[PDB]
Amino acid sequence: VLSEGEWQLVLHVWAKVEADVAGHGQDIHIRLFKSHPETLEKHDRFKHLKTEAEMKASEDLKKHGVTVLTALGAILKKKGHHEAELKPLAQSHATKHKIPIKYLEFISEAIIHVLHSRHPGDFGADAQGAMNKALELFRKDIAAKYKELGYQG
Ligand code: HEM
């Protein structure tokens, strides 16, 4: 469970994220695809974009990024009482897309990287540790929802 103070740090940095959701989306995905290439294969519509620049100019990918970070941002604002908008995420991702929890760790890594690269003065030790706790709570709860629908993490 997160402290009031940690939740505040998380939401403090997210507010910076929200000043350019689109750019953060692209960067996080680009990081993810380059760092763990097996991830790009889950996306049939992106798995041809060869270059970073091709990645950055794809408006399909751009929009996807915003859709992903908007869902995550609604969950973080719940400060962990996120049952209701966690469930549709787990049902899509467990039954349809079939995203292993390890791929969720991978994008968790990409998020923290990008966050630290774009906002170091607002993303120091305390803030990274808080965000990390936030994303680890999210992954635990989704792994439990995954199991409730079958197929284990
Ligand atoms: C922070 C963790 C994640 C967030 C919040 C997120 C969020 C979303 C949302 C909101 C959608 C659209 C509705 C639906 O879920 O189908 C989506 C679709 C999708 N997500 Fe995730 N996602 C996460 C990470 C992942 C990862 C790591 C991958 C693995 C490549 C993945 C693959 C997909 C795929 C394949 C779809 C369907 C895309 C399509 O064919 O249009 N997502 N995601």
| Domain range annotation of the chain | 1-153
Method used to obtain the model: X-ray
CA distances from 2 to 37, 120, 131 (A): 32, 22, 10
The tokens of 86 are what?
């966690």
**What resolution in angstrom units was achieved for this structure?**
1.9
Work out whether the CA dihedral 110, 114, 120, 121 comes out positive or negative: negative
Q: How far apart are CA 119 and CA 44, in angstroms?
A: 32
From 151, 147, 25, select the one nearest 87 (Cα to Cα).
147
Q: What CATH superfamily is the domain 1-153? A: Globins (1.10.490.10)
Q: Cα(68) to centroid of ligand 1, in Å?
A: 6
Annotated binding residue 116: no
CA distances from 101 to 48, 77, 94, 120, 153 (A): 24, 22, 9, 28, 5
Burial of 109 (0-12, 13-18, 19+ CB in 10 A): middle
Distance CA 119, CA 103 (A): 24
> What residue ranges line ligand 1, CB within 6 angstroms?
39, 42-43, 67-68, 71-72, 89, 92-93, 97, 99, 103-104, 107
Interatomic CA distance for residues 108 and 118, integer angstroms: 16
